[PDB]
Amino acid sequence: DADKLPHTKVTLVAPPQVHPHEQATKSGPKVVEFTMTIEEKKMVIDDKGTTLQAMTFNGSMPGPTLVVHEGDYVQLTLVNPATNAMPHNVDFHGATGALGGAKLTNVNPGEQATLRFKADRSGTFVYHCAPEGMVPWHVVSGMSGTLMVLPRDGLKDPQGKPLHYDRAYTIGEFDLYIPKGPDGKYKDYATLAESYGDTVQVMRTLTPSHIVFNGKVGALTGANALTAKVGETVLLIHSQANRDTRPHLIGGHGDWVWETGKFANPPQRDLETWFIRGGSAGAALYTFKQPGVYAYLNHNLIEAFELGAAGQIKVEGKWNDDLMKQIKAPAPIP
Amino acid sequence: DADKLPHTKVTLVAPPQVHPHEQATKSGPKVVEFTMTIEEKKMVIDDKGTTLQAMTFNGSMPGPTLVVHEGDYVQLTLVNPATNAMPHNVDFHGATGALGGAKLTNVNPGEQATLRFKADRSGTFVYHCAPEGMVPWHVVSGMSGTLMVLPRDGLKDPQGKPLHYDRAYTIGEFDLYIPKGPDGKYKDYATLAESYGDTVQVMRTLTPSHIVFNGKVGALTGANALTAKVGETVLLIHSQANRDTRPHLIGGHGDWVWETGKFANPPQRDLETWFIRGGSAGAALYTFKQPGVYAYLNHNLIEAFELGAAGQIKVEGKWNDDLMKQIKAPAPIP
Amino acid sequence: DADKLPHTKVTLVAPPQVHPHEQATKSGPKVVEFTMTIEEKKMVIDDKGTTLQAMTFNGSMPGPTLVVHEGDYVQLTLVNPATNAMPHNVDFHGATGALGGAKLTNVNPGEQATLRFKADRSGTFVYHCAPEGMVPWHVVSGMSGTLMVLPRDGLKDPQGKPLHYDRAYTIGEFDLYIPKGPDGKYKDYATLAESYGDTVQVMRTLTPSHIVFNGKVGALTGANALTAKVGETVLLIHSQANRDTRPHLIGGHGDWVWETGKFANPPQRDLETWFIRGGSAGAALYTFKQPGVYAYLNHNLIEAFELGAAGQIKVEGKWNDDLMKQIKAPAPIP
Numbered sequence A, B, C: 001d002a003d004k005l006p007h008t009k010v011t012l013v014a015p016p017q018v019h020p021h022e023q024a025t026k027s028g029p030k031v032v033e034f035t036m037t038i039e040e041k042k043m044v045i046d047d048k049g050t051t052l053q054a055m056t057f058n059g060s061m062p063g064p065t066l067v068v069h070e071g072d073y074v075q076l077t078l079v080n081p082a083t084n085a086m087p088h089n090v091d092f093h094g095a096t097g098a099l100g101g102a103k104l105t106n107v108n109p110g111e112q113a114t115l116r117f118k119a120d121r122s123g124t125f126v127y128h129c130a131p132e133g134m135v136p137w138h139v140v141s142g143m144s145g146t147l148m149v150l151p152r153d154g155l156k157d158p159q160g161k162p163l164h165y166d167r168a169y170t171i172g173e174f175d176l177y178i179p180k181g182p183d184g185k186y187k188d189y190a191t192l193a194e195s196y197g198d199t200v201q202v203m204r205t206l207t208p209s210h211i212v213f214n215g216k217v218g219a220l221t222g223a224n225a226l227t228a229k230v231g232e233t234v235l236l237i238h239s240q241a242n243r244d245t246r247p248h249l250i251g252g253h254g255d256w257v258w259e260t261g262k263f264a265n266p267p268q269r270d271l272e273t274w275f276i277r278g279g280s281a282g283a284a285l286y287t288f289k290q291p292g293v294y295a296y297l298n299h300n301l302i303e304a305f306e307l308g309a310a311g312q313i314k315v316e317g318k319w320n321d322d323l324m325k326q327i328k329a330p331a332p333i334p
């Protein structure tokens, strides 16, 4: 019975980081308490100044990643401030019943609610807003993120041997549908409500204007690149709440990958490219063996390089000539 | 030798139901006999009165699901009445040889044929019409369904333990390509033949005008919702003969899923969203634990809510506060 | 240490063939040496005379398949003749570090370089050109192929039992983005450089004008059909460096399939249709049981029959009435 369990309180952190947590643990089940506050805002999503009338959990795309263990109960307080214009809610794919909790968390601006559900299944799961009649709009405008439910004894390989990560990053990939006017320029809307009708028209074409990691072209590049060192294992959590994507690490691999994102299933190894189904979150482990700047992208290379679905990981350490060596540098042909 | 085996005769039923059958069985192999009659007809596919010049097996989209056991022989009589305008045939993905049987079942209006093949592989398999030179048109106009070949000893989990369903539903998802005229309204064609050239032009854009379960927007919603009770296991058979989709049960999961649809492979568990490749049928088991109305949809939410790829399952029984509880209902913020 | 190993030299062959190689082998690791020469050229890609300003490894789309064993080192010499206009390089998904080798193989026209990397992971892996700032263009214009890294003891089934192929074919599937002018005809460009800006515009729509196997509509059909005999096992290597596809053998199956293409993972059996993620190569084994002409295609049937993604395999041998029999030929209805 959940009433008798100890309660713990978790402080969320902004993507691409993930809040401190244990993997394998000796702890018994808890009611883990989180709070998120919805923020509607206009956001600049590319280098040329295009805006999106956006909607977010906790001010970021994606929302923050919530982490518990299998057997825990998630208890979320969802706050919709009066400064917002729209009603909202939350649908946890990791939860059982009531349209993922959507039916029990309908909050108008100035309202809040508290949902509890049992995280009885391990994996990365999408959570997203789902107000009746406007579900796709809320999702594609930015209202999604990941619940990671770790097995109580940590991750396991196909033979039941222990797996771990030394650092976790969360990447949300957003297919955006920004309208254009008669002049072929992207439209800038004074309010969220005014963007709706034009946006639905773009949505129905099924062609994104932009596809971005973490809310904007270049969000995870240059100074905002992910980081690691040779010998460190990274978990890359990839969520896509609306559309398929195909993650790849250039110069790397998915050492162990759960592309459907459910940890009770054996992972696949040595992947070049994996597949996240629209409406899901997946997870890949990789241990870096070479230093340098890696690209982490959607391997529809148009979607990556033209439309925005690409980032970087800057990796420190010592080059390894056994794994790779320039035998003869570029030089004239004999 | 198939000539020495007992023959049985099966009466098909309309989707979303599936005809009575055994899962695990003590029976030896049989020649199982079915008959289907092709019906070309104009069908209303949405709420605003849009029509499709459709083609069907047995008058429905999808065609009915045929169920046998591994080692059985399927013996289909395919009837093409003289009231039809086009030639037709059938390609069983579950069969070996002759383009799935297409080469041996070419039937002009007023003709019929009888095909036999050995169902030597377990799984859900697409069957579809495939006349030379017009294959995509016949498929996207509605001529597909599922052959389910159960293992003789029933479904099994990754550890070889028994799995079962208490009820089976079949869902066919149809990407439609309805042309529009200069006024931006959908075209209404007097005959099947007249729809062809305009439709091929829409097809080549790769953008469906509509994507529907079972032949129309809302076919599996409201009064036509699927049904179940808490404690019952449902098999959800999902076919898509032309285009990828990503099934999800809102507030539920795929407890055991064969997304490529082939039962000799271990299923995956705890899926939020699975993937049916265009040209295949997949299958998911789920045991309901909460009552209420669930949505079962393609989790490209545009494809679902805007274009039509969504239905409902109405589930009876007792709410379970351990799995989910509204701790604090929506109420003003402190 | 790679310097102490024996060097071997391999002569590449044109797709759809694959160069002679061993599967299971008693040989220890080698440094296997290959050379490829880039050729930019205009190519006719369909029946109506449409051209593509193409870019290739070794004059073909796809490039040739390179085959080694796990533990070998690949040592490629990449030649960019002075007759080419653009700089190029190579990114091996099978390699670790330096953006797959791209950073160490930047070659202007008239230059060459030699890369070595350790093929420490078994599977089929994409290789492709990846010049900074122009990656998608080089890829979609034809610069990709497959590195197959076989396990030293050959392929294995889920229970660790031996698998083999008697013949291997390599199929590269290319989503092309050919621009049109104001008259609705495809544009013909005098040079590679001139095609760029118009092509990027088509790319950004995400709608291919054509999707072809091995560089052109019908490349693997009629006289250029693949061949086999009843009782022979074929390996079908399928690469797609930019966009998803869904291979299917009409009248056949994937007997054992590694759709993510990584041989240390158990294969799936009895597949009707499998899924190659954009940015990957997959592999399927099939043993023919019936003679006749099979179609091997992308089972988005529009992509196959309308846009070009389909070929044929002509199979010799004796028909098998147990697997399939025309019980009653097409004939009038009673």
Ligand SMILES: O=N[O-]
Pocket (backbone or CB within 6 Å): A248, A249, A250, A251, A299, C091, C093, C100, C130
């Ligand atoms: O593997 N570079 O897209």
Ligand SMILES: O=N[O-]
Pocket (backbone or CB within 6 Å): A091, A093, A100, A130, B248, B249, B250, B251, B299
């Ligand atoms: O999980 N609701 O799309």
Ligand SMILES: O=N[O-]
Pocket (backbone or CB within 6 Å): B091, B093, B100, B130, C248, C249, C250, C251, C299
């Ligand atoms: O299975 N014929 O597309």
Ligand SMILES: [Cu+2]
Pocket (backbone or CB within 6 Å): A055, A087, A088, A089, A129, A130, A131, A138, A143
């Ligand atoms: Cu919302």
Ligand SMILES: [Cu+2]
Pocket (backbone or CB within 6 Å): A091, A093, A126, A128, A279, B248, B299
């Ligand atoms: Cu959802």
Ligand SMILES: [Cu+2]
Pocket (backbone or CB within 6 Å): B055, B087, B088, B089, B129, B130, B131, B138, B143
């Ligand atoms: Cu037909």
Ligand SMILES: [Cu+2]
Pocket (backbone or CB within 6 Å): B091, B093, B126, B128, B279, C248, C299
């Ligand atoms: Cu088919």
Ligand SMILES: [Cu+2]
Pocket (backbone or CB within 6 Å): C055, C087, C088, C089, C129, C130, C131, C138, C143
């Ligand atoms: Cu190049």
Ligand SMILES: [Cu+2]
Pocket (backbone or CB within 6 Å): A248, A299, C091, C093, C126, C128, C279
């Ligand atoms: Cu790549």
Ligand SMILES: [Zn+2]
Pocket (backbone or CB within 6 Å): A030, A032, A068, A069, A072
């Ligand atoms: Zn915990």
Ligand SMILES: [Zn+2]
Pocket (backbone or CB within 6 Å): A164, A165, A166, A231, A232, A233
């Ligand atoms: Zn570590």
Ligand SMILES: [Zn+2]
Pocket (backbone or CB within 6 Å): B030, B032, B068, B069, B072
């Ligand atoms: Zn039977």
Ligand SMILES: [Zn+2]
Pocket (backbone or CB within 6 Å): B164, B165, B166, B231, B232, B233
């Ligand atoms: Zn039951």
Ligand SMILES: [Zn+2]
Pocket (backbone or CB within 6 Å): C030, C032, C068, C069, C072
């Ligand atoms: Zn070798």
Ligand SMILES: [Zn+2]
Pocket (backbone or CB within 6 Å): C164, C165, C166, C231, C232, C233
């Ligand atoms: Zn053999």
